[PDB]
Design a protein around this ligand. Structure first.
Ligand SMILES: Nc1ncnc2c1ncn2[C@@H]1O[C@H](COP(=O)(O)OP(=O)(O)O)[C@@H](O)[C@H]1O
Ligand SMILES: [Mg+2]
Length: 177
């Protein structure tokens, strides 16, 4: 939660054209935000680049100018949590509040490779939020450099074609450099 205590659309000081465009987009996005549209953003990019900073920021600006409460998860942390209350088998309540969330930040959704069972949980959670028009914000890592659709196949390679295709029809792509 709070290495990003300070994370605000407002500390925000962009340092290249990438970051400025990203901040403009985010601003427009938050201002027209409608839990109902199930629209989101995807932040790609090498690391230490302020992708996650911007996603926390986006989540805050939402509920500051729209009073809607999001949720912020490290994708692996979420998955790991869920598998464990899902085979202890008791809590359907955590799963439901995560799936039905009006805004959800899946930080690092899928950088690195995901074993069959984490793959299954992601596909589930994304199929659900896709079907139910639930706005979902994603940050993922991309590294080899000079776009659109390689970023597609690269993401597709550890997430699956299916999840990535859906991610695209829900989210606008913001490459931060
Ligand atoms: N433009 C910026 N303004 C303020 N802080 C930033 C900016 N870019 C990066 N940071 C800070 O740098 C650190 C790393 O950023 P992070 O969001 O984790 O990048 P990434 O998620 O791309 O790895 C964070 O603590 C974040 O607060
Ligand atoms: Mg990050």
């Amino acid at each position: 939660a709070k290495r990003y205590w300070n994370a605000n659309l407002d500390t925000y000081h962009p340092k290249n054209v990438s970051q400025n465009r990203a901040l403009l987009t985010i601003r427009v996005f938050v201002h027209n935000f409608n839990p109902e549209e199930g629209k989101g953003l995807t932040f790609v990019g090498s690391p230490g680049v302020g992708k996650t900073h911007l996603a926390v920021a986006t989540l805050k600006a939402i509920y500051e100018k729209k009073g809607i409460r999001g949720y912020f998860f490290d994708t692996k942390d979420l998955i790991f949590r869920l598998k464990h209350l899902m085979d202890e088998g008791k809590d359907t309540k955590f799963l439901k509040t995560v799936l039905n969330s009006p805004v959800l930040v899946l930080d690092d959704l899928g950088s690195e490779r995901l074993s069959d069972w984490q793959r299954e949980l992601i596909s589930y959670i994304i199929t659900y939020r896709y079907n139910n028009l639930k706005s979902t914000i994603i940050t993922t890592n991309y590294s080899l450099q000079r776009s659109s659709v390689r970023i597609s196949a690269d993401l597709a390679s550890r997430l699956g074609e299916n999840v990535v295709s859906k991610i695209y029809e829900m989210n606008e792509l913001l490459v931060i450099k």
